[PDB]
Amino acid sequence: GKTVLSCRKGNGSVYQVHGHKRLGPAKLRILDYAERHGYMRGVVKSIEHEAGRGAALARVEFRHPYKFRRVKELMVAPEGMFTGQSVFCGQKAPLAIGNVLPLGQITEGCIVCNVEAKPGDRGTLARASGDYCIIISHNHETGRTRLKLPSGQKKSVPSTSRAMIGIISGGGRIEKPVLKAGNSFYRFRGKRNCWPKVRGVARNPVEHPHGGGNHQHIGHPSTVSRHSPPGQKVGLIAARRTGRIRGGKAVKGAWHPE
Amino acid sequence: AKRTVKMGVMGRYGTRYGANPRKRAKKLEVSQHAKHFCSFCGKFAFRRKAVGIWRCDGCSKTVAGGAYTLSTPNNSTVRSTVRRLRELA
RNA sequence: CGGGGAAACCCAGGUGGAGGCCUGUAGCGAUGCUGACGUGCAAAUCGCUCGUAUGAUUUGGGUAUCGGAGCGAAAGACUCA
RNA sequence: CACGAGUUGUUCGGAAACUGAGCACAACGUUAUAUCGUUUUGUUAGGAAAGUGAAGGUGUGUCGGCGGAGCUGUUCGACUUGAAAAGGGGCAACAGAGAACCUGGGAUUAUAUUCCAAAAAGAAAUUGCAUGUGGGA
RNA sequence: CCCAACUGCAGACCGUACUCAUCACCGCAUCAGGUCCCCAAGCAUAGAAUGCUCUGGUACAUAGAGAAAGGUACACUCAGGGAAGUCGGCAAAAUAGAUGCGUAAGUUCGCAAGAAGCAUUGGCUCUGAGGGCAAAAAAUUGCCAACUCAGAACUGCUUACGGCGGGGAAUCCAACUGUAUAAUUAAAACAUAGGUUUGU
RNA sequence: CGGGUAAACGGCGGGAGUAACUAUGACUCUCUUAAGGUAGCCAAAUGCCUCGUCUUCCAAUUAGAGACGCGCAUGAAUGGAUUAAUGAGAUUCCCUCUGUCCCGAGUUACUAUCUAGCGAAACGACAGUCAAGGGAACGGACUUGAAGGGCUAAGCGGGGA
RNA sequence: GCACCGUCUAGGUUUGGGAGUCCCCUGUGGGUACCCAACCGUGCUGUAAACUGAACCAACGGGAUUGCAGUUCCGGAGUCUUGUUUCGAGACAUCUGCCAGAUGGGGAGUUUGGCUG
RNA sequence: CGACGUCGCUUUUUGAUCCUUCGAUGUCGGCUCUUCCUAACCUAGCGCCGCAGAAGACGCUAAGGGUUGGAUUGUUCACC
RNA sequence: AGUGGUAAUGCGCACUUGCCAGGUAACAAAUCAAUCCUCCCACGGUGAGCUUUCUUUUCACCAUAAUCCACCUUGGGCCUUUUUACUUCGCGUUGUUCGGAGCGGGGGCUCAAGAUUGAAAAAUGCAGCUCUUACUGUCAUUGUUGUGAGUUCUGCGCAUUAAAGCAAAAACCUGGGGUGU
RNA sequence: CAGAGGUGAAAUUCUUAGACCGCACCAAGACGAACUACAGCGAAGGCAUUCUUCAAGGAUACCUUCCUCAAUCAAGAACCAA
Ligand SMILES: C#CCOc1ccc(C[C@H]2NC[C@H](O)[C@H]2OC(C)=O)cc1
Ligand SMILES: [K+]
Ligand SMILES: [K+]
Ligand SMILES: [K+]
Ligand SMILES: [K+]
Ligand SMILES: [K+]
Ligand SMILES: [K+]
Ligand SMILES: [K+]
Ligand SMILES: [K+]
Ligand SMILES: [Mg+2]
Ligand SMILES: [Mg+2]
Ligand SMILES: [Mg+2]
Ligand SMILES: [Mg+2]
Ligand SMILES: [Mg+2]
Ligand SMILES: [Mg+2]
Ligand SMILES: [Mg+2]
Ligand SMILES: [Mg+2]
Ligand SMILES: [Mg+2]
Ligand SMILES: [Mg+2]
Ligand SMILES: [Mg+2]
Ligand SMILES: [Mg+2]
Ligand SMILES: [Mg+2]
Ligand SMILES: [Mg+2]
Ligand SMILES: [Mg+2]
Ligand SMILES: [Mg+2]
Ligand SMILES: [Mg+2]
Ligand SMILES: [Mg+2]
Ligand SMILES: [Mg+2]
Ligand SMILES: [Mg+2]
Ligand SMILES: [Mg+2]
Ligand SMILES: [Mg+2]
Ligand SMILES: [Mg+2]
Ligand SMILES: [Mg+2]
Ligand SMILES: [Mg+2]
Ligand SMILES: [Mg+2]
Ligand SMILES: [Mg+2]
Ligand SMILES: [Mg+2]
Ligand SMILES: [Mg+2]
Ligand SMILES: [Mg+2]
Ligand SMILES: [Mg+2]
Ligand SMILES: [Mg+2]
Ligand SMILES: [Mg+2]
Ligand SMILES: [Mg+2]
Ligand SMILES: [Mg+2]
Ligand SMILES: [Mg+2]
Ligand SMILES: [Mg+2]
Ligand SMILES: [Mg+2]
Ligand SMILES: [Mg+2]
Ligand SMILES: [Mg+2]
Ligand SMILES: [Mg+2]
Ligand SMILES: [Mg+2]
Ligand SMILES: [Mg+2]
Ligand SMILES: [Mg+2]
Ligand SMILES: [Mg+2]
Ligand SMILES: [Mg+2]
Ligand SMILES: [Mg+2]
Ligand SMILES: [Mg+2]
Ligand SMILES: [Mg+2]
Ligand SMILES: [Mg+2]
Ligand SMILES: [Mg+2]
Ligand SMILES: [Mg+2]
Ligand SMILES: [Mg+2]
Ligand SMILES: [Mg+2]
Ligand SMILES: [Mg+2]
Ligand SMILES: [Mg+2]
Ligand SMILES: [Mg+2]
Ligand SMILES: [Mg+2]
Ligand SMILES: [Mg+2]
Ligand SMILES: [Mg+2]
Ligand SMILES: [Mg+2]
Ligand SMILES: [Mg+2]
Ligand SMILES: [Mg+2]
Ligand SMILES: [Mg+2]
Ligand SMILES: [Mg+2]
Ligand SMILES: [Mg+2]
Ligand SMILES: [Mg+2]
Ligand SMILES: [Mg+2]
Ligand SMILES: [Mg+2]
Ligand SMILES: [Mg+2]
Ligand SMILES: [Mg+2]
Ligand SMILES: [Mg+2]
Ligand SMILES: [Mg+2]
Ligand SMILES: [Mg+2]
Ligand SMILES: [Mg+2]
Ligand SMILES: [Mg+2]
Ligand SMILES: [Mg+2]
Ligand SMILES: [Mg+2]
Ligand SMILES: [Mg+2]
Ligand code: NA
Ligand code: NA
Ligand code: NA
Ligand code: NA
Ligand code: NA
Ligand SMILES: [Zn+2]
């Protein structure tokens, strides 16, 4: 046979990110000494759109804590952030939308975004538009904070990890029907080369396991094992169930005993 | 005189794409092109300049919020919760 | 901007110039004549006819992905007849 | 076909001298084998890759003021103590960025914003050095 | 030592001919194929349609003689009938611009629709309407430019350049715009928006 | 081994009797499956029989449409049914229109044709009139007959399997 | 056992101690309301609803070499290091190699009789 | 005209065979055009009949001449 | 050791790459106005064509490069003043607007496009010709209108459908500090 | 530790892989028992924990105000358990 398309994309080549016209990675400011013991005051300078990303981005100007210069960090803007707003990041920052606080300084039930999975990773959770985390509780004995992720999973992280108060801007994007192939064309123009999508049963058997036949059909079950090698692992990978979901959509992902 | 009966801005699509998908998009299309109240400066001059970006013509302020409306309903509740939790401390 | 109405709102004129909208050049294609030619002008061309022609549009240069591999809106198509 | 000629630039295009999609020298790692891999999400490499230099001190040269051509102190350029500057060297656009000239000619067989000579047919614009004048030091 | 207006001297390197195509490049060739950019006149006309023309270019593509049959054509016509032809209306014929009136079922209310259908159109000589600027009920007084539309009388047609939809009633398939077997298949195939599922 | 899962792959019955004429079978019995095809749709681009049967369209209908359904072998995201608009998609009918036809005729340009100049290729065992006969069962050669004076121009498609 | 290494602090609360309102015109200008100790605290001069500012290349004070100025150190700017850059995890993990077994058309190689009206 | 039987002819059907052709003999149908056969539909004669007439049946000699336009179907056939 | 104006900002006022901050480079639809130029008119000069008859006619030409000096038309931003500017409002576009977060009016500041005067520059170019050969001299002309039609230069962007929001850098410019002090 | 569930009686079902039962907890979504009545509020539909809030609504009180502004209705409009 021939290499399946899903495996061909692992080489990169013409399937990589369209990174041109992007402003760069969006991150919180570095977890420095001022963040750990006091706070840093920044000014929102602009709210900008980046190609391929639904959420708005914010350019926040800080003073250098050690040198005579400005920093101008770029982070994912929560909803309601505006130009000229003062942003407080650190241990002593007040609980307000747009401020970045240690998770241990945030009350139960507060809605947070841009959450650090590990302390100092500059924000890795709840970053897509309209997404947020909910703080369940803190445990002062082990210094861990429990939060509910946007997918419904519950995760515990160190209390020293930082979170931004609020929800990510740009919510409701998916609720507008696209209505046109051309509109899908422009949506993926800024992301990567992954559209349009050709069905596996529409390909030839040399290319896909689903290809071939005098009728367009999958002649074998489409649920495949987790251990199947690349090129064989197409269809519904390691599916626990199939068909219409009735009476409640269970939380997807792998079970974590914590 | 009124130029269409049922569809408004959706009349640019002619007979394509189906009535129900057009109706669902019409509600967001109308809101994303409308003037929203600016809490600053007290004007109805907020316009969308990209998905999630709103700039007021009156005071030139730029605000991040909502793909097709200035403020999502979830943000209004979140704003109230944060202020409530701030007063509790 | 007229005309109605208690209200909700409705009916009339104009302005404006939207659209993977229509007719139609260039451009990009190739439906039929199963036309011409078929030791051809041509190892695929010619004529008329025909599709589309603000868009998922056409095009120059540069750059990136290849041989059991590449690439493919998927015809086993294309990768210097 | 044979013989003999023709292409003239401070300003035109390129380079000197920009970055882009990208490339891959060094470095490191890998491979029996480098003819392999990483090398722009601000950016090489377990990684000591800056030879550049504020300010001073110390001499020289151009000045200044003071009191008695010299003396002290002082300004600014040359020669000899070390703040701060993280992230090696390069290529990739003759349609992107950049770029100080443009008319007349009786000036050719053929080149010309490229040739024309004192009435330059002429009128300019720009760099790099200098000299003198004017003014500050 | 540093500024201003001058002035003096010096401004290095490579490219530069010609071509860019129905003869200069690729296609074995001076091959009706292919090949990016700039400047682009007059009249008709909606006009980069099409037709003809000043400037510039060209008469180079083997010619002469010349009503055999049979051919090819970016050439026509045909009485009476009018699809009886043929697998099949293939091919050809047909419609035709502009303006006024008018237009069904169905429908996602957007369309269908140029639906279908009637009518007018020339040339001449006129008449109205549609403006600008200037001057102390200026609701007038002067001067003047570009055109368009409408309405009359008179006078015509041999229906007469080019260009330019035939229409209607239904079934099957695919929603649609698109893509796609370079060189026998453009489709109902692929894509598509929409829907669902899986892993995380 | 024990649970889950079909918008996973897929699958979704047979016989017998029965209603005041007859037919039919609401009803009943019985054999059996994981479940026995539900809503719908159809001689459909899916029906063998098959040019099914009825109505309509025609003077005449293996065609088209509308009905019917024991469906060889229809059927629900292996998506079912419907559907305005759209289509160089497949099909039937009507108006218009015509050299498509009855049934052909006339004309034009460029050829063919003749000339000047120039000048190939394919193909080529040897050759080249027939009848019958036998024969490797379909001869240009052989047998027996019948033809046949030689050389040429333009055509033509019977043969040269 | 004792003693050394080995120690300094913002701020908060409350125990001892000593020690200096004045000029110019009701107004204006300048200036004084401190140190020590204990307890907590733990390295702490700014914000507790947000709408866009500036901040560098130190003043200053001591100790030496009235005041003032040179060359200096000292602190202003706490000190120390049985040493890890910091954080999370952690002697497990597939983290590294080796051995072993299942699964494995993803892929490779090969085969898929004969007679025959 | 002809049951039960029986003797033939033909090569316009299919089957049987595998002689020719697999370094290739262009496949169905239609269109067009010519010729040939006769087992005679019409046209010329002639017999016979359950032959009155009319219309027909059967048979003989004779292939000179003629043998149509359409709907459906790719059809050959078929049917109207 | 800069300086004027209430102000918008004006003036020919030193050094700054130690350092820092901004800007230019730097991007964008459509509508409507439209530049240089092109084409048409109108009027007028010069030469040629037609001229049995007509034709105050037909055709051609009537050109002004960079670089500089001086300084009324439109469009935008802004300043000052009057703001008793919006109670059953006003200004403006073809067009979707705008205003006590300061509309309109008076007077101004500034930016961008162009007028206009002049230097260059007639000494050039073009056409016809006198003289008489030398690719000779002499001489004549040497233009303006157009509410005409085109024309993307420009006005024009925080500037387009947008789940599309439209490169970067060198180089340069200005300021904040500082130096001069 | 050997049954539990369920019914007229049963069985489908759960259970030594520990069901049922017992105690204190955790999560999530409903609901607001008793008090609850020929009781209250609302135009009807409807409405039941507490606290903090925002607009209303009725009755009563008045030597306030005012001066026929009203009753009921096609058309039209709003609300309306499941
Ligand atoms: C399918 C099928 C049946 O129909 C055919 C049709 C033609 C042929 C070709 C043969 N005919 C004679 C010779 O043997 C071959 O000729 C050639 C040129 O190969 C075979 C079968
Ligand atoms: K793609
Ligand atoms: K298949
Ligand atoms: K693609
Ligand atoms: K390499
Ligand atoms: K395709
Ligand atoms: K054969
Ligand atoms: K007879
Ligand atoms: K238990
Ligand atoms: Mg590869
Ligand atoms: Mg697909
Ligand atoms: Mg296929
Ligand atoms: Mg396969
Ligand atoms: Mg399918
Ligand atoms: Mg399928
Ligand atoms: Mg339009
Ligand atoms: Mg279109
Ligand atoms: Mg079209
Ligand atoms: Mg079309
Ligand atoms: Mg072309
Ligand atoms: Mg052909
Ligand atoms: Mg031929
Ligand atoms: Mg075309
Ligand atoms: Mg290769
Ligand atoms: Mg295939
Ligand atoms: Mg030569
Ligand atoms: Mg030579
Ligand atoms: Mg990388
Ligand atoms: Mg790069
Ligand atoms: Mg590098
Ligand atoms: Mg690195
Ligand atoms: Mg380069
Ligand atoms: Mg080039
Ligand atoms: Mg360039
Ligand atoms: Mg140059
Ligand atoms: Mg030349
Ligand atoms: Mg040259
Ligand atoms: Mg040249
Ligand atoms: Mg050219
Ligand atoms: Mg060549
Ligand atoms: Mg070659
Ligand atoms: Mg043309
Ligand atoms: Mg034209
Ligand atoms: Mg000519
Ligand atoms: Mg030629
Ligand atoms: Mg010729
Ligand atoms: Mg020729
Ligand atoms: Mg002929
Ligand atoms: Mg017919
Ligand atoms: Mg026929
Ligand atoms: Mg037929
Ligand atoms: Mg046709
Ligand atoms: Mg209707
Ligand atoms: Mg049907
Ligand atoms: Mg389609
Ligand atoms: Mg289209
Ligand atoms: Mg199409
Ligand atoms: Mg493609
Ligand atoms: Mg093809
Ligand atoms: Mg084709
Ligand atoms: Mg499909
Ligand atoms: Mg669907
Ligand atoms: Mg199930
Ligand atoms: Mg059924
Ligand atoms: Mg059926
Ligand atoms: Mg069968
Ligand atoms: Mg028919
Ligand atoms: Mg039917
Ligand atoms: Mg089936
Ligand atoms: Mg089925
Ligand atoms: Mg199903
Ligand atoms: Mg013979
Ligand atoms: Mg032959
Ligand atoms: Mg022939
Ligand atoms: Mg396998
Ligand atoms: Mg295999
Ligand atoms: Mg065998
Ligand atoms: Mg036989
Ligand atoms: Mg045989
Ligand atoms: Mg042959
Ligand atoms: Mg042979
Ligand atoms: Mg043959
Ligand atoms: Mg006979
Ligand atoms: Mg006969
Ligand atoms: Mg005969
Ligand atoms: Mg810009
Ligand atoms: Mg209660
Ligand atoms: Mg309900
Ligand atoms: Na990338
Ligand atoms: Na050619
Ligand atoms: Na089509
Ligand atoms: Na032979
Ligand atoms: Na013989
Ligand atoms: Zn505002």
Cα distance spanning the termini of chain A: 44 Å
Please state the CA-atom Rg of chain B, rounded to the nearest Å: 17 Å
Shape of chain B: elongated
Percent of residues in helices of chain A comes to under 10%
Spatial extent as radius of gyration of chain A: 23 Å
Most extensive interface: A-B, 40 and 35 residues
The counted number of beta strands of chain B is: 4
* Tally of separate helices of chain B: 2
Biggest β-sheet strands, sense, barrel of chain B: 4 strands, antiparallel
Classify the helix fraction of chain B into a percent range. Answer: 25-40%
Give the distinct bound molecules: ligand A1IWA, potassium ion, magnesium ion, sodium ion, zinc ion
Report the structural category of chain B. alpha+beta
Oligomeric state of the chains?
part of a larger assembly
Report the end-to-end length of chain B measured between terminal Cα atoms. 59 Å
What characteristics describe this protein?
part of a larger assembly, 2 chains, A: 258 residues, mainly beta, 6% helix, 21% strand, globular, B: 89 residues, alpha+beta, four-stranded antiparallel β-sheet, 18% strand, binds ligand A1IWA, binds potassium ion, binds magnesium ion, binds sodium ion, ribosome, 80S, LM14Cs1H3, Putative 60S ribosomal protein L2
